[PDB]
Amino acid sequence: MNKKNILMYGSLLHDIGKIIYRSHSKLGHQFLSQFSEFKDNEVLDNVAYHHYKELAKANLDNDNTAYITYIADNIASLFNFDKYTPLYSVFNIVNSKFKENIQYSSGNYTTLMKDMSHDLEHKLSIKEGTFPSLLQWTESLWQYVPSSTNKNQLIDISLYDHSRITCAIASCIFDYLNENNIHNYKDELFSKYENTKSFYQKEAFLLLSMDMSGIQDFIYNISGSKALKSLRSRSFYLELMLEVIVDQLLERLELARANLLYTGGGHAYLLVSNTDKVKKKITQFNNELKKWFMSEFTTDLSLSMAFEKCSGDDLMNTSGNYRTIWRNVSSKLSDIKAHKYSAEDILKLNHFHSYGDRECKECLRSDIDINDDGLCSICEGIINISNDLRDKSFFVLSETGKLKMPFNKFISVIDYEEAEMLVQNNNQVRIYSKNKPYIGIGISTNLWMCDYDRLGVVRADIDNLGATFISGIPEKYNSISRTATLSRQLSLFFKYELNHLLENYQITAIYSGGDDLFLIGAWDDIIEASIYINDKFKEFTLDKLTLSAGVGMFSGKYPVSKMAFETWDEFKKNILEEKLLVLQQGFSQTDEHGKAFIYKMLALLRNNEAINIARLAYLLARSKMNEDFTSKIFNWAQNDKDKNQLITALEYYI
Amino acid sequence: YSKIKISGTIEVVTGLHIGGGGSPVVRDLQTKLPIIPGSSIKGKMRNLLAKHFDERVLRLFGSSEKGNIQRARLQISDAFFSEKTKEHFAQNDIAYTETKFENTINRLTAVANPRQIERVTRGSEFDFVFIYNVDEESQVEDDFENIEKAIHLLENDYLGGGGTRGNGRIQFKDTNIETVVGEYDSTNLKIK
Amino acid sequence: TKVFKLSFKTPVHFGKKRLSDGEMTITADTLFSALFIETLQLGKDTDWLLNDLIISDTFPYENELYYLPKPLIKIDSNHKAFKKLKYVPVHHYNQYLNGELSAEDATDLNDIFNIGYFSLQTKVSLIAQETDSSADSEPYSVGTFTFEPEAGLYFIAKGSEETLDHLNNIMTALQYSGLGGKRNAGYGQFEYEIINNQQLSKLLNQNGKHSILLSTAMAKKEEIESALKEARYILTKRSGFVQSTNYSEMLVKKSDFYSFSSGSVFKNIFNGDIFNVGHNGKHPVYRYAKPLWLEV
């Protein structure tokens, strides 16, 4: 096995034994010492020797992955562990629990043990490129397993999060040490505590970040009759371009899928090594990507990538410099965004007189070349993927496909059986999903995307997301792993609950992710679901994160590219809950009160003059509604706030 | 090369109804005062004058869809309430816009189906501005004759919806014609 | 070097890509085009008004406040409110460059930014077979913008005195034709006033090491290497059609061109140039790229 891969497999399971005890190092080693697939001695050594007391007498070689696994645990992170400790949600601590005085039980861990033995016996196999599968299984299995159950520590970190960050860190460490011509890790690191602190301060990591330039305009120049079918696929397409870009990058750097920490909007974040070759490769890849985008769009989309040197000592939130490097990489990203092209680039750019046809009615774009029936090529593929997005759920990176990808690649759609056939074919494919878990078919990458399906449109943004992502919890929990887990929770919510909750609403999910919620549907349904989503968020954020949202009513068949640019408890309790219901009951009780009667009411209210108050009184008198109903309307009209509220309620009434 | 300016007022003898929102009427999303979008004027004028007969229409309003480029010779803007109508109505406390109740009868059922149409008030005045860029000195007289006929037709016809059903008759008053670009005389051009 | 201020009293549609798209401000390209074609309609001599006139992009104004677009300088702190802001009043223009503008100050300014609103007008078309025989009408949409009674647009121009007089005459003549988009449809007339703001005049009359490109420009072939040395800039694709050039309008359309946006900062000043975007036409078609710098 590749020593890097041995590192990967061992690190990923270094702290597994806790779950067995909760049903240490030695417990994990014995348990993992039972399995034909995973019986590698060095992988077992990583698990058996991840504690200092164990490393003291392990008598391992000067070049051992166990030492790297140990430093990974330390960088990622009196000691009475309660097996019944519940995991706590960070969201409270952000602006200062799961399954409220709840407590776990022993039998749950035993159940997981059975599950893990089963999936180890039948689902998992070791090979040159099977780490991703193992990581997928770990993620699916441990997502609410507490990592540290120390009573004196604020328990909010997943065992899965612990494992992933540790593996990423260790991989980084291995690359950095090997490239620095260092092999005697026992003496390079473990020799002295001062030597360990020297390595902590030694810049060994780069934080790398990526950003699409042109989100809004390219997502939003749609005018055709397939507005839903177009937009639903466009959002997915840009997202998948991001996904394929990042995956290609991770492949090139020979790094693991664990090393991705967050994706969203056009942003993505990774922890990579601080070596020269890595930087050259980053240079080459960046140039290539820019070449591809320019060969493609030339303004509409671009990728800017920026990286910053760092030592894990700051990753330990030692001086609060983790937030500083995050802000530095954000400023660096904006600097790359400013300088997008060179002199020769634009020199070619402004000199390209080409015989072209006209704009694709779907694609408000002239540069791309229509062929037949005013239809180009890339747009045509967008319509095709939209038709197959709902029924088919599996996507494959193939050399021949209907969708053009940046790295001279193509995307197609398949079934679960076709994906199994590709495993037998042993083709260079990756599986991209519709939130499909427990698959275990070849490279089963469960990518997250929420596909659920006058008009109403609601757009929402997290208000305090800039501060939450960087400052988050001040001075004591700004660990890289910890903000990662915060990101993870937010991501999983915004990509899973958005699927689940939408069940009862006549809504199609158009754009969800990062902090952007772009939903369209039926006006009444849109308003109701928006209320539902606000309440559900306030539950899941424990009232710690807030959202600002707007709903606008637009005529059908409008160009949605123009609708989008158009776009609480007060609204819920007072207007909808109080006024709307009583008005509805009254109009239920008294018929003939059509839009004529209500419209006269509207006229009476809209002209705010006292004589109009008298007129409203008389008109109410001519009705036959119960005296209490008419008197309530009259009293509401007297108050400016209550009149504005009644007006809004009745406008909703129609 | 000269431009001739034609401004005046148009009076709603029977209530007007454009309704770009539609049963609303065109307004400003701020002033909330009725306007008559000029393009509507242009469309009605063109339909009428073309129905009077073609080159002349192309000369007047411009199409450039048959490969022949001529460019519009007439610019018609929307109009607004004059200050006069606003002050009179505020003084007399008259609403600007009427809501007419309508009804429709099914046959073989004889049931009633209520309807609502928002009409501009009778008697209000709109200040309109036309601009005629005389690109050919030796044709302008002809053109104005044509524009005259167009105006004349509109005088006995309607704008907007339901015009068969009894709304949209307008009138033209206080038309004055002035030259504002170039040095071309306009003391003999006449429009009622 | 006078500046012109514009009032419309009737909404005008600008537009970027589609007729239903609406804008508040236009770039120097459109203005140069319109002024040029108005000269051609007047038929005067273009060479004088070809290679001597320097124009800024259009800029919105309010009752008594004049603004400039946001310079893309690197400020080191919040990085949220500053992103949402586009325009800065002259009062604190140099203050922002220094860094005196506070986050709450930005909040306040953005709050005052109510200088017009956007709207969609629906229009129907019965020139089709709807009236001729059995067919349906053709609704379509336009986007229009209604400036406040004391709101509109202004540009900053410089050149010789004779150039300024000619521009004065052409501007008067154009006053009555339109600008923006559906001119003939009833949008975009204007009456203008020439006002000299002492403060803005000072703003144009500074001297510094940086310089803010106020127009839509792009250096020649042989200057770009030395121009792009240290800059912060945005490229802005300019496409569009042309008027009374060749047989088929839908066949005629100037090639997509690129220029820097109007908030870029440059170290090495470059003169720009009026580029031909012409091909397969009966005359050359001019697109404008020449800078007016505010030197600070």
mmCIF file of N, CA and C in Angstrom, chain A residues 53-152:
data_model
loop_
_atom_site.group_PDB
_atom_site.id
_atom_site.type_symbol
_atom_site.label_atom_id
_atom_site.label_comp_id
_atom_site.label_asym_id
_atom_site.label_seq_id
_atom_site.Cartn_x
_atom_site.Cartn_y
_atom_site.Cartn_z
ATOM 1 N N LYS A 53 1.045 7.940 26.058
ATOM 2 C CA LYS A 53 1.501 6.838 26.951
ATOM 3 C C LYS A 53 1.849 5.607 26.108
ATOM 4 N N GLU A 54 1.077 5.347 25.050
ATOM 5 C CA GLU A 54 1.333 4.209 24.179
ATOM 6 C C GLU A 54 2.568 4.452 23.326
ATOM 7 N N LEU A 55 2.705 5.663 22.789
ATOM 8 C CA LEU A 55 3.875 5.988 21.990
ATOM 9 C C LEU A 55 5.156 5.969 22.806
ATOM 10 N N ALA A 56 5.049 6.039 24.132
ATOM 11 C CA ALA A 56 6.239 6.100 24.968
ATOM 12 C C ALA A 56 7.060 4.826 24.864
ATOM 13 N N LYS A 57 6.402 3.677 24.746
ATOM 14 C CA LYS A 57 7.101 2.405 24.706
ATOM 15 C C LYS A 57 6.828 1.613 23.438
ATOM 16 N N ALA A 58 6.234 2.227 22.417
ATOM 17 C CA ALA A 58 5.899 1.494 21.204
ATOM 18 C C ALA A 58 7.131 1.025 20.437
ATOM 19 N N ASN A 59 8.292 1.636 20.681
ATOM 20 C CA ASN A 59 9.552 1.240 20.043
ATOM 21 C C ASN A 59 9.419 1.203 18.524
ATOM 22 N N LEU A 60 8.649 2.142 17.983
ATOM 23 C CA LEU A 60 8.434 2.198 16.548
ATOM 24 C C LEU A 60 9.642 2.818 15.847
ATOM 25 N N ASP A 61 9.677 2.651 14.527
ATOM 26 C CA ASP A 61 10.760 3.204 13.728
ATOM 27 C C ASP A 61 10.711 4.730 13.729
ATOM 28 N N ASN A 62 11.872 5.340 13.465
ATOM 29 C CA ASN A 62 11.955 6.794 13.377
ATOM 30 C C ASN A 62 11.028 7.354 12.310
ATOM 31 N N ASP A 63 10.677 6.513 11.330
ATOM 32 C CA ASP A 63 9.747 6.926 10.247
ATOM 33 C C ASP A 63 8.444 6.133 10.390
ATOM 34 N N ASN A 64 7.518 6.613 11.226
ATOM 35 C CA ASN A 64 6.247 5.874 11.464
ATOM 36 C C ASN A 64 5.048 6.813 11.286
ATOM 37 N N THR A 65 3.982 6.324 10.645
ATOM 38 C CA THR A 65 2.758 7.143 10.425
ATOM 39 C C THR A 65 2.025 7.352 11.756
ATOM 40 N N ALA A 66 2.298 6.509 12.759
ATOM 41 C CA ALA A 66 1.644 6.632 14.085
ATOM 42 C C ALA A 66 1.996 7.981 14.723
ATOM 43 N N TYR A 67 3.255 8.419 14.601
ATOM 44 C CA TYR A 67 3.673 9.742 15.140
ATOM 45 C C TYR A 67 2.896 10.850 14.421
ATOM 46 N N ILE A 68 2.747 10.730 13.098
ATOM 47 C CA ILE A 68 1.984 11.736 12.300
ATOM 48 C C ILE A 68 0.522 11.727 12.763
ATOM 49 N N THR A 69 -0.049 10.538 12.976
ATOM 50 C CA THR A 69 -1.458 10.416 13.445
ATOM 51 C C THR A 69 -1.593 11.089 14.817
ATOM 52 N N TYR A 70 -0.591 10.923 15.687
ATOM 53 C CA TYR A 70 -0.627 11.529 17.044
ATOM 54 C C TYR A 70 -0.671 13.058 16.928
ATOM 55 N N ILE A 71 0.215 13.639 16.109
ATOM 56 C CA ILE A 71 0.269 15.127 15.971
ATOM 57 C C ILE A 71 -1.035 15.613 15.321
ATOM 58 N N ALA A 72 -1.649 14.795 14.457
ATOM 59 C CA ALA A 72 -2.943 15.165 13.838
ATOM 60 C C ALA A 72 -3.993 15.343 14.937
ATOM 61 N N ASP A 73 -4.069 14.389 15.871
ATOM 62 C CA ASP A 73 -5.026 14.487 17.005
ATOM 63 C C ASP A 73 -4.748 15.780 17.775
ATOM 64 N N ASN A 74 -3.479 16.048 18.100
ATOM 65 C CA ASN A 74 -3.125 17.244 18.914
ATOM 66 C C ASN A 74 -3.540 18.528 18.185
ATOM 67 N N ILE A 75 -3.212 18.650 16.893
ATOM 68 C CA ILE A 75 -3.516 19.900 16.131
ATOM 69 C C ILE A 75 -5.038 20.083 16.056
ATOM 70 N N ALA A 76 -5.778 19.009 15.759
ATOM 71 C CA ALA A 76 -7.255 19.089 15.656
ATOM 72 C C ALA A 76 -7.845 19.523 17.003
ATOM 73 N N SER A 77 -7.297 19.013 18.112
ATOM 74 C CA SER A 77 -7.785 19.386 19.467
ATOM 75 C C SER A 77 -6.939 20.535 20.030
ATOM 76 N N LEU A 78 -10.310 14.786 35.590
ATOM 77 C CA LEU A 78 -9.902 15.739 34.565
ATOM 78 C C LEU A 78 -10.300 15.255 33.175
ATOM 79 N N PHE A 79 -10.165 13.952 32.945
ATOM 80 C CA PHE A 79 -10.488 13.329 31.665
ATOM 81 C C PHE A 79 -11.443 12.158 31.869
ATOM 82 N N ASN A 80 -12.492 12.382 32.657
ATOM 83 C CA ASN A 80 -13.504 11.357 32.895
ATOM 84 C C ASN A 80 -14.540 11.429 31.779
ATOM 85 N N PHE A 81 -14.554 10.415 30.916
ATOM 86 C CA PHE A 81 -15.443 10.379 29.758
ATOM 87 C C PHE A 81 -16.733 9.662 30.141
ATOM 88 N N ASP A 82 -17.861 10.355 30.010
ATOM 89 C CA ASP A 82 -19.167 9.737 30.197
ATOM 90 C C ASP A 82 -19.679 9.236 28.854
ATOM 91 N N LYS A 83 -19.965 7.938 28.786
ATOM 92 C CA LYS A 83 -20.520 7.364 27.572
ATOM 93 C C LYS A 83 -21.898 7.920 27.251
ATOM 94 N N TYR A 84 -22.564 8.543 28.217
ATOM 95 C CA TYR A 84 -23.912 9.043 28.021
ATOM 96 C C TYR A 84 -23.951 10.538 27.753
ATOM 97 N N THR A 85 -22.808 11.148 27.474
ATOM 98 C CA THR A 85 -22.780 12.573 27.186
ATOM 99 C C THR A 85 -23.495 12.863 25.870
ATOM 100 N N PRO A 86 -24.449 13.788 25.850
ATOM 101 C CA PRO A 86 -25.088 14.160 24.585
ATOM 102 C C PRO A 86 -24.296 15.217 23.832
ATOM 103 N N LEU A 87 -24.361 15.137 22.508
ATOM 104 C CA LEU A 87 -23.750 16.150 21.660
ATOM 105 C C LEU A 87 -24.542 17.452 21.718
ATOM 106 N N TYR A 88 -23.828 18.569 21.833
ATOM 107 C CA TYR A 88 -24.438 19.887 21.956
ATOM 108 C C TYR A 88 -24.320 20.649 20.645
ATOM 109 N N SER A 89 -25.372 21.387 20.300
ATOM 110 C CA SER A 89 -25.365 22.191 19.085
ATOM 111 C C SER A 89 -24.547 23.460 19.278
ATOM 112 N N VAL A 90 -23.678 23.743 18.311
ATOM 113 C CA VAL A 90 -22.803 24.900 18.419
ATOM 114 C C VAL A 90 -23.593 26.188 18.309
ATOM 115 N N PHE A 91 -24.744 26.163 17.623
ATOM 116 C CA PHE A 91 -25.422 27.404 17.254
ATOM 117 C C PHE A 91 -25.703 28.276 18.461
ATOM 118 N N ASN A 92 -26.028 27.658 19.593
ATOM 119 C CA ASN A 92 -26.187 28.408 20.830
ATOM 120 C C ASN A 92 -24.898 29.138 21.192
ATOM 121 N N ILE A 93 -23.784 28.400 21.221
ATOM 122 C CA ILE A 93 -22.501 28.965 21.608
ATOM 123 C C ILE A 93 -21.990 29.979 20.602
ATOM 124 N N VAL A 94 -22.511 29.957 19.379
ATOM 125 C CA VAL A 94 -22.086 30.919 18.363
ATOM 126 C C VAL A 94 -22.324 32.339 18.852
ATOM 127 N N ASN A 95 -23.573 32.656 19.167
ATOM 128 C CA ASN A 95 -23.924 33.971 19.670
ATOM 129 C C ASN A 95 -24.170 33.994 21.172
ATOM 130 N N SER A 96 -23.719 32.971 21.904
ATOM 131 C CA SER A 96 -23.872 32.978 23.355
ATOM 132 C C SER A 96 -23.179 34.169 24.004
ATOM 133 N N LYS A 97 -27.977 17.585 23.648
ATOM 134 C CA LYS A 97 -29.025 18.372 22.945
ATOM 135 C C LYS A 97 -29.699 17.491 21.889
ATOM 136 N N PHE A 98 -28.910 16.878 21.000
ATOM 137 C CA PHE A 98 -29.467 16.027 19.961
ATOM 138 C C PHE A 98 -29.794 14.631 20.481
ATOM 139 N N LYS A 99 -30.330 13.814 19.581
ATOM 140 C CA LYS A 99 -30.777 12.471 19.910
ATOM 141 C C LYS A 99 -29.929 11.421 19.209
ATOM 142 N N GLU A 100 -34.523 20.545 26.705
ATOM 143 C CA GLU A 100 -34.553 19.104 26.334
ATOM 144 C C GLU A 100 -33.423 18.372 27.066
ATOM 145 N N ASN A 101 -33.744 17.702 28.178
ATOM 146 C CA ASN A 101 -32.720 16.960 28.962
ATOM 147 C C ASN A 101 -32.638 15.518 28.446
ATOM 148 N N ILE A 102 -32.121 15.333 27.228
ATOM 149 C CA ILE A 102 -31.984 13.969 26.633
ATOM 150 C C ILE A 102 -30.635 13.379 27.063
ATOM 151 N N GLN A 103 -30.525 12.050 27.098
ATOM 152 C CA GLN A 103 -29.233 11.397 27.437
ATOM 153 C C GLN A 103 -29.092 10.125 26.599
ATOM 154 N N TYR A 104 -27.907 9.888 26.027
ATOM 155 C CA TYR A 104 -27.694 8.670 25.262
ATOM 156 C C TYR A 104 -27.654 7.444 26.171
ATOM 157 N N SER A 105 -27.658 6.268 25.542
ATOM 158 C CA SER A 105 -27.656 4.999 26.254
ATOM 159 C C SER A 105 -26.610 4.077 25.643
ATOM 160 N N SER A 106 -26.225 3.056 26.413
ATOM 161 C CA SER A 106 -25.180 2.138 25.968
ATOM 162 C C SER A 106 -25.611 1.367 24.730
ATOM 163 N N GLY A 107 -26.861 0.905 24.707
ATOM 164 C CA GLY A 107 -27.302 0.059 23.619
ATOM 165 C C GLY A 107 -27.138 0.686 22.255
ATOM 166 N N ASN A 108 -27.207 2.015 22.167
ATOM 167 C CA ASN A 108 -27.033 2.673 20.877
ATOM 168 C C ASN A 108 -25.653 2.396 20.310
ATOM 169 N N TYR A 109 -24.629 2.521 21.150
ATOM 170 C CA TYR A 109 -23.278 2.233 20.696
ATOM 171 C C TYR A 109 -23.147 0.782 20.274
ATOM 172 N N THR A 110 -23.778 -0.128 21.009
ATOM 173 C CA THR A 110 -23.728 -1.527 20.613
ATOM 174 C C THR A 110 -24.367 -1.717 19.249
ATOM 175 N N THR A 111 -25.487 -1.036 19.017
ATOM 176 C CA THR A 111 -26.149 -1.102 17.722
ATOM 177 C C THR A 111 -25.219 -0.627 16.624
ATOM 178 N N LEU A 112 -24.552 0.498 16.857
ATOM 179 C CA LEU A 112 -23.595 0.996 15.881
ATOM 180 C C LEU A 112 -22.466 0.007 15.678
ATOM 181 N N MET A 113 -22.058 -0.674 16.744
ATOM 182 C CA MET A 113 -21.007 -1.676 16.636
ATOM 183 C C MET A 113 -21.432 -2.796 15.702
ATOM 184 N N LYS A 114 -22.654 -3.292 15.884
ATOM 185 C CA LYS A 114 -23.182 -4.302 14.977
ATOM 186 C C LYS A 114 -23.202 -3.774 13.553
ATOM 187 N N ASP A 115 -23.690 -2.549 13.385
ATOM 188 C CA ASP A 115 -23.774 -1.973 12.057
ATOM 189 C C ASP A 115 -22.398 -1.878 11.433
ATOM 190 N N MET A 116 -21.409 -1.499 12.228
ATOM 191 C CA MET A 116 -20.073 -1.296 11.710
ATOM 192 C C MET A 116 -19.419 -2.614 11.360
ATOM 193 N N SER A 117 -19.630 -3.635 12.180
ATOM 194 C CA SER A 117 -19.113 -4.949 11.837
ATOM 195 C C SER A 117 -19.749 -5.444 10.552
ATOM 196 N N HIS A 118 -21.054 -5.225 10.399
ATOM 197 C CA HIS A 118 -21.732 -5.641 9.178
ATOM 198 C C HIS A 118 -21.147 -4.934 7.960
ATOM 199 N N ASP A 119 -21.112 -3.600 7.999
ATOM 200 C CA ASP A 119 -20.618 -2.832 6.862
ATOM 201 C C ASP A 119 -19.141 -3.093 6.615
ATOM 202 N N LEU A 120 -18.413 -3.498 7.663
ATOM 203 C CA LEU A 120 -16.981 -3.861 7.493
ATOM 204 C C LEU A 120 -16.911 -5.219 6.800
ATOM 205 N N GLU A 121 -17.833 -6.126 7.139
ATOM 206 C CA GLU A 121 -17.785 -7.466 6.584
ATOM 207 C C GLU A 121 -18.215 -7.496 5.129
ATOM 208 N N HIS A 122 -19.142 -6.624 4.738
ATOM 209 C CA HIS A 122 -19.767 -6.763 3.431
ATOM 210 C C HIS A 122 -19.625 -5.563 2.505
ATOM 211 N N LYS A 123 -19.471 -4.352 3.032
ATOM 212 C CA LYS A 123 -19.523 -3.153 2.203
ATOM 213 C C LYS A 123 -18.166 -2.526 1.936
ATOM 214 N N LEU A 124 -17.223 -2.713 2.864
ATOM 215 C CA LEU A 124 -15.923 -2.000 2.740
ATOM 216 C C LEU A 124 -14.791 -2.912 2.264
ATOM 217 N N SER A 125 -13.967 -2.411 1.341
ATOM 218 C CA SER A 125 -12.816 -3.141 0.835
ATOM 219 C C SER A 125 -11.644 -2.178 0.751
ATOM 220 N N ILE A 126 -10.444 -2.690 1.044
ATOM 221 C CA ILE A 126 -9.217 -1.838 0.996
ATOM 222 C C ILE A 126 -8.584 -1.955 -0.397
ATOM 223 N N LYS A 127 -8.125 -0.832 -0.959
ATOM 224 C CA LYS A 127 -7.434 -0.840 -2.278
ATOM 225 C C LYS A 127 -6.705 0.497 -2.454
ATOM 226 N N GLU A 128 -6.134 0.740 -3.636
ATOM 227 C CA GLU A 128 -5.348 1.982 -3.870
ATOM 228 C C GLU A 128 -6.258 3.209 -3.720
ATOM 229 N N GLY A 129 -7.493 3.134 -4.225
ATOM 230 C CA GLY A 129 -8.418 4.283 -4.154
ATOM 231 C C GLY A 129 -9.765 3.902 -3.567
ATOM 232 N N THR A 130 -9.791 3.493 -2.294
ATOM 233 C CA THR A 130 -11.075 3.159 -1.617
ATOM 234 C C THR A 130 -11.248 4.020 -0.361
ATOM 235 N N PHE A 131 -10.272 4.879 -0.050
ATOM 236 C CA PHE A 131 -10.429 5.817 1.097
ATOM 237 C C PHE A 131 -11.785 6.531 0.993
ATOM 238 N N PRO A 132 -12.145 7.163 -0.150
ATOM 239 C CA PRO A 132 -13.412 7.884 -0.258
ATOM 240 C C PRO A 132 -14.589 7.063 0.203
ATOM 241 N N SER A 133 -14.626 5.779 -0.137
ATOM 242 C CA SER A 133 -15.729 4.957 0.337
ATOM 243 C C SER A 133 -15.711 4.851 1.851
ATOM 244 N N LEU A 134 -14.534 4.618 2.421
ATOM 245 C CA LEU A 134 -14.439 4.508 3.865
ATOM 246 C C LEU A 134 -14.911 5.788 4.527
ATOM 247 N N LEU A 135 -14.506 6.928 3.973
ATOM 248 C CA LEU A 135 -14.922 8.213 4.510
ATOM 249 C C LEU A 135 -16.423 8.379 4.399
ATOM 250 N N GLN A 136 -16.994 7.954 3.281
ATOM 251 C CA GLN A 136 -18.433 8.058 3.135
ATOM 252 C C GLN A 136 -19.130 7.252 4.213
ATOM 253 N N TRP A 137 -18.654 6.031 4.443
ATOM 254 C CA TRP A 137 -19.276 5.191 5.455
ATOM 255 C C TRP A 137 -19.113 5.797 6.833
ATOM 256 N N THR A 138 -17.925 6.318 7.126
ATOM 257 C CA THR A 138 -17.697 6.958 8.413
ATOM 258 C C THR A 138 -18.647 8.123 8.609
ATOM 259 N N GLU A 139 -18.773 8.964 7.589
ATOM 260 C CA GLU A 139 -19.669 10.098 7.681
ATOM 261 C C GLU A 139 -21.078 9.634 7.967
ATOM 262 N N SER A 140 -21.552 8.665 7.199
ATOM 263 C CA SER A 140 -22.928 8.226 7.355
ATOM 264 C C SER A 140 -23.151 7.606 8.725
ATOM 265 N N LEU A 141 -22.113 7.011 9.297
ATOM 266 C CA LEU A 141 -22.323 6.231 10.502
ATOM 267 C C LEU A 141 -22.114 7.015 11.787
ATOM 268 N N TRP A 142 -21.286 8.056 11.785
ATOM 269 C CA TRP A 142 -20.864 8.663 13.042
ATOM 270 C C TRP A 142 -21.414 10.062 13.278
ATOM 271 N N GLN A 143 -22.271 10.569 12.390
ATOM 272 C CA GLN A 143 -22.566 11.998 12.337
ATOM 273 C C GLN A 143 -23.155 12.557 13.625
ATOM 274 N N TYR A 144 -23.699 11.727 14.509
ATOM 275 C CA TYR A 144 -24.123 12.242 15.804
ATOM 276 C C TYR A 144 -23.497 11.442 16.936
ATOM 277 N N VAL A 145 -22.293 10.935 16.711
ATOM 278 C CA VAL A 145 -21.505 10.264 17.740
ATOM 279 C C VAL A 145 -20.563 11.291 18.352
ATOM 280 N N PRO A 146 -20.640 11.556 19.651
ATOM 281 C CA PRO A 146 -19.745 12.552 20.243
ATOM 282 C C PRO A 146 -18.299 12.099 20.162
ATOM 283 N N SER A 147 -17.416 13.042 19.838
ATOM 284 C CA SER A 147 -15.998 12.724 19.739
ATOM 285 C C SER A 147 -15.359 12.696 21.115
ATOM 286 N N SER A 148 -15.378 13.829 21.799
ATOM 287 C CA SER A 148 -14.907 13.929 23.168
ATOM 288 C C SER A 148 -16.118 14.066 24.071
ATOM 289 N N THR A 149 -16.184 13.231 25.105
ATOM 290 C CA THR A 149 -17.247 13.285 26.101
ATOM 291 C C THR A 149 -16.711 13.790 27.437
ATOM 292 N N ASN A 150 -15.672 14.619 27.377
ATOM 293 C CA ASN A 150 -15.096 15.192 28.581
ATOM 294 C C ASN A 150 -16.088 16.152 29.217
ATOM 295 N N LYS A 151 -16.405 15.908 30.487
ATOM 296 C CA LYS A 151 -17.422 16.693 31.175
ATOM 297 C C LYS A 151 -17.019 18.149 31.355
ATOM 298 N N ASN A 152 -15.729 18.435 31.479
ATOM 299 C CA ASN A 152 -15.271 19.792 31.727
ATOM 300 C C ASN A 152 -15.066 20.576 30.445
#
